[PDB]
DNA sequence: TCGGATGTATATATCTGACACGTGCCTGGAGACTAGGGAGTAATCCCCTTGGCGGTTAAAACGCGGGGGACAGCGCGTACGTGCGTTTAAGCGGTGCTAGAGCTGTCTACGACCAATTGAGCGGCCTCGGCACCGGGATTCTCGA
DNA sequence: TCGAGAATCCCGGTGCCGAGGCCGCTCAATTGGTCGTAGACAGCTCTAGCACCGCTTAAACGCACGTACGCGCTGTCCCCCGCGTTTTAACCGCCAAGGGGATTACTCCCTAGTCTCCAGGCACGTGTCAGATATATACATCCGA
C-alpha cells in the first residue's frame, strides 16, 4: 500500500487534506492523525447526503440527480436541515406545504 | 448613459407570483411599494459590499465570486457558483 | 432644506428644518404653525418612532421627505 | 491552469452507494462547495479550540471535540465512531 | 360563461408555482436596476452575467422567506389577507431594522 | 380605600425597569443548574462566577423574549399575552423548528 | 427543583419587559424554554471542560460557550 | 519608542507582537500596528466621551456599567455595531407602549 | 504570580485626556478590556482573511483600511480611515 | 345530491446536446533519514469549594370581592378576484469590436533574526474622599364625591 | 370638574471601603545590521462584455362586474388583580477540612525539513442515449340547476 488513503481503506484523499491543513495557517504544527479523521468524517457526510439524494431521485422515476432532489433530501431530514439552517441552495425550490385554514371547506 | 426610474421594472404580476410561491392567497393593493423598498435596500447593501470587495481587487469588473463573498459575510452563504 | 409632514387628516405641511435641528425644535415648530402640543404629536418616518433630543443628521433624513403624524390624546 | 475539485472522489462514493445512478454538473458543484464549507468550519473550530487550550499542535483529540461541538447528537456519535475506526485501522499497519 | 369562485384559481397557482423550480422575475429589468444601483457607488462598472444571476437568486430566496413569515403573521392576526403592517411586524421581530 | 387595576402594574413597570438588579433567587438557580448538569456528568464542581454569568445570560434572553411576545400580543389587538404569542415569536425568530 | 422558579419571580421578570396582564400558562411556557436554553448552554460548557481535562467548570468556559452561539457576553474577562 | 513618534496613546509594540504571534499571516508590514492602534483609540475615546457625558448628566463622578449601557444604546451607530451583545448590570431603556398608557 | 496584561493604563490616559475630572469602576475596566479585545479580534481576522483571499502572504495598511470600511458603519468608517491615515502619514514623516 | 366543461395525469415518437469514458503527461506525493523543541509524567503546595448550624425576617403562599376584558353574533359597504381585448416590450438569432482580464520576466526595496541594553509596565501598600444608609420634610397624583 | 393620602423626590447628616497614587523590580521593546525573496512594473495576448438590428408573440395594462370579507356595535360570563393574613426558607455570619488547580523539573519521541523518484489526476477529445417537445387521450375536479 503506497498511497496513504489505501492504508486506511478510505476514498477521500489524505495527502491533499494534510497539505491544505498545513498551508491553511490553522496551527504552527500538525499531527499525523488529523487528516485520516477529517477525511473519514467528510466521506461519511458525503455518503449520507448522496444516498438521501439517490433515494429521492429514485422516488421520481429518473436516473440522474438534479438540485431539486438535493433540496428535497436536505429539507426532509431534521438534523441535516438544522445543520444547513442558514444556507440557500440554487434552483432548489421550496417544500409543498399549505396552511390548513387556507384550504376550502 | 444615465439611468433613472428603473424600480418600476419589477411589475405587479411578478410580485404577485412571488407571493403565490410563498403560499399567500389574498393580496391587498398596497404591499407593492414596501416590497420594492425592501428589495431596494437589500440590493443596495449587497451591491455596496461587492463594490468595495472588487475595489480592493484593483480591477474594473465585478465577478460573481465577489458577490458570493459579500453574501457569505452577512451570514446568508449560497451554494452553486464555486468557492 | 425643507421636508413635509402629513397627519391622518391628509393635510401635509412644510417643515423648514436643518440637520442640526432636533425633534424638540421641530415639535416647537408644529406648535408655532399648527398649535398642537407635542404630547399628542406622534411621528413615523421609515417605520421608526423618534424620541426627543437627537438630530436629523443622525438619521440622515433626506430632503422632500414626508412623515406620518397622529394626535395621541 | 489546474482547477482542483472533489469530483472524482464524490463520483466514487456515489458509485459505491448506488450502482446505476448518474450525476449532473450543478449537483457536483454543490457537493464541492458543501465539502469545502464543512472542512473550513471544522478546521477553524479546531484551531480556535487549540489556541484556547494553550497548545501549539493540532491532533485527533481537538478534531473529535470539534465534531462533538458542531454536529448534532446521533450524527456526532456516528462520525466519531467512523473516525476512531479509521484511525485505529490506519495505525494498526 | 364559466365563472370560478374566488380562491380556486389562487389555489391552482399556489400549487403550480410551488411544484416548479425556476425563477420568476424577468432578466433585463433586473439587470437594468442592478446597473443603475451600482452606478452611484462607482462609475463605469462592468458586470458579469453570473453575478446578476446570483443577485437574482438571493433576492428571490429573501423575498420568498419574507412573504412566508408575513403570511404566518397575517393568519395569526385572524385575517386572510396580508397587509403592510404584517410586513413591518415580521421585519421587526426578525431582528432587522425597520 | 382601593386602587383600580392597571395603576400599580404601571408603578412596578417603572420601578423594575428603572433599576439594574437581578430578580431570580440565587440558591434555587444554583440547585437547578447543578441538577441539570448532573446528567452530562456527576460530581461536577462550579465556580460562583460561572453561575452568575449563566444567570445574567438567562435573564437577558428571557427579558428579550418577553418583550417580543408583548409586541406580538399588542399587534394582535390584545392586551394580555398568551402562549400562542410565545410560540409565534419563537417560530418567527427562527430558533424553533 | 425546576418548580423553584416562583410565579412572582417570573411575573417580575416579565414586568421588566413591559407587559401589563398575565394569563395562566405563561409560567409553564417560560419554564420549558428556560429548560431548553440551559440544557444547551451547560451541555456546551460541559463539553468544553471535558476537553480541558478538569473537574471544575470555569466562567471562561461559559463565556466561550455563549460566544459560540452568537450570544457573546461582556464583563467576565472574555 | 514608537507610539511617541505617531503621537498616540495605545502601544504600537504590543499590537505588533499580538499580530505577529496570532498567526494571522506569514509576515506583517511596518504600517499595520499604527493604523490599528489609531482606530482602536478613536473608538475607545468616542465610547468614553459618551459614557462621561451620561455620567455627568446624573450628577455623579464615576462611571458604572449602567452609564456605558445607556451611552451605547442611545447612539444609533454604536448600537448597531454592538447588536448581538449584552452588558452585565446594564438594564433596559425606559420605554412604554403608547396604547398601554391610561386613557 | 502570573503577569496578566490589560489595557487599563491606556484607556485611563484616554479618559483623562477627554475628561479631566472623572473616575471609573473596575467592572467598567473589564467591559472596556473585553470590548477592545473583541473589536481587535474582528478587524484582524477579517484583514487576514482578505489578505490570504486575494492570493497574498502579507498584511499591510491597505487590507486593514478595507476591513475598516467593511465592518465599521459609514460615518465612523470615514472618521476611522481619516484618523488612521493621519497617524500613518505623521509616523512616516519622521524617522 | 347530479352532469358538462374544464384541467390534469398518462402513453408514445424523436432528436438532440450533455455526460461517461479513452489518452498523454507533468507536478505533487511517497520512501528514507535527521535533529531538536514540545509535550507527557511526577511531586508539591495552598487556595477555593463543599459542608453544616443558628436566627430573623422578608418573601412566599392561600383565600376573597369584583369590575374590566376576551369572545361570539349581526349588519354593511367597499376592495379585490375574474374574465376580456388591446398594446408593447422581452426574448431569440446573428454581427462587430474593442477594453481589459490574465500570464510572463525583472530587479528592487522591505521584512525576519540575531546580540546588547534598558525603562516601561506589573505587583504590593496605603490613605482618604466619594458613595451608601438613615431620618425628615415638601410635592403630586390618584381614587372617591 | 373638586376633595384627601400615600407615594415619591429632595435635603442634611454620618459612616465606611474601593480607587488613585507611590515604590520596587524583571522582562519585553529598542537599536545597529545582514540577507533573501514578494511583488510592483512593463509587456503582450487572446477573450468576453457591450452596442445593435430585425423579427416574433407571449406577456403586460386597463376596464366591467360582482361578491365575500374587514370592521364596528352589542352583549355576556368569567377570571386576574389588589388586600389581608399565615407560613417558611434565604441569607448572613461563622467555623473546618481537603482535593484539585497551578507550578516546577526532568526526559523522550514526533514532526518539519531535505532529497530523489514516480504515478494520479487533469486538460483534451469523442461517441450516444435520457429527457425535453409535441401529440393524443382518458381520468379528476369544479360550478349550478
Numbering used by the authors:
A (entry chain G): 14 to 118
B (entry chain B): 20 to 102
C (entry chain K): 1 to 73
D (entry chain H): 29 to 121
E (entry chain A): 38 to 135
F (entry chain E): 39 to 135
G (entry chain F): 25 to 102
H (entry chain C): 16 to 118
Tell me, in the authors' exact words, what the paper reports:
To see whether ubiquitin conjugated to H2A-K119 adopts discrete positions, we determined cryoEM structures of the nucleosome core particle containing ubiquitinated histone H2A-K119 and Widom 601 DNA (147 bp). The cryoEM dataset revealed two distinct ubiquitin positions, denoted H2Aub positions 1 and 2, with global resolution estimates for the corresponding EM maps of 3.41 and 3.47 Å, respectively. The ubiquitin in H2Aub position 1 binds to the nucleosome surface over histones H3 and H4, immediately adjacent to the acidic patch. In this position, ubiquitin partially overlaps the acidic patch, with an occluded surface area of 480 Å2 as measured with a 5 Å probe radius. Since heterochromatic regions are characterized by chromatin that is condensed and enriched in H2AK119ub, we explored whether the ubiquitin in H2Aub position 1 could be accommodated within higher-order nucleosome packing. Modeling using the structure of a compacted tetranucleosome shows that the ubiquitin in H2Aub position 1 can be readily accommodated between two stacked nucleosomes without steric clash. Ubiquitin in this position can also accommodate binding of the linker histone H1, which binds to the nucleosome dyad, promotes chromatin condensation and is abundant in heterochromatic regions. By contrast, cryoEM maps of H2AK119ub nucleosomes revealed only one stable ubiquitin position on the face of the nucleosome, which only partly overlaps the H2A/H2B acidic patch. The KD of RCC1 for nucleosomes containing H2AK119ub was measured by SPR to be 540 ± 90 nM, similar to the KD of RCC1 for unmodified nucleosomes. These results indicate that ubiquitin conjugated to H2AK119 does not interfere with RCC1 binding to the nucleosome, consistent with our cryoEM data showing that ubiquitin in H2AK119ub nucleosomes only partly occludes the nucleosome acidic patch.
The nucleosome is the fundamental organizational unit of chromatin and comprises two copies each of histones H2A, H2B, H3, and H4 wrapped by ∼147 base pairs (bp) of DNA. The nucleosome contains a conserved cluster of negatively charged residues in histones H2A and H2B, known as the nucleosome acidic patch, that is a hotspot for interactions with proteins that regulate transcription, the cell cycle, and the DNA damage response. Monoubiquitination of histones H2B-K120 (H2BK120ub) and H2A-K119 (H2AK119ub) play opposing roles in transcription regulation and chromatin compaction. Our results suggest a mechanism by which H2BK120ub serves as a gatekeeper to the acidic patch and point to distinct roles for histone H2AK119 and H2BK120 ubiquitination in regulating protein binding to nucleosomes.
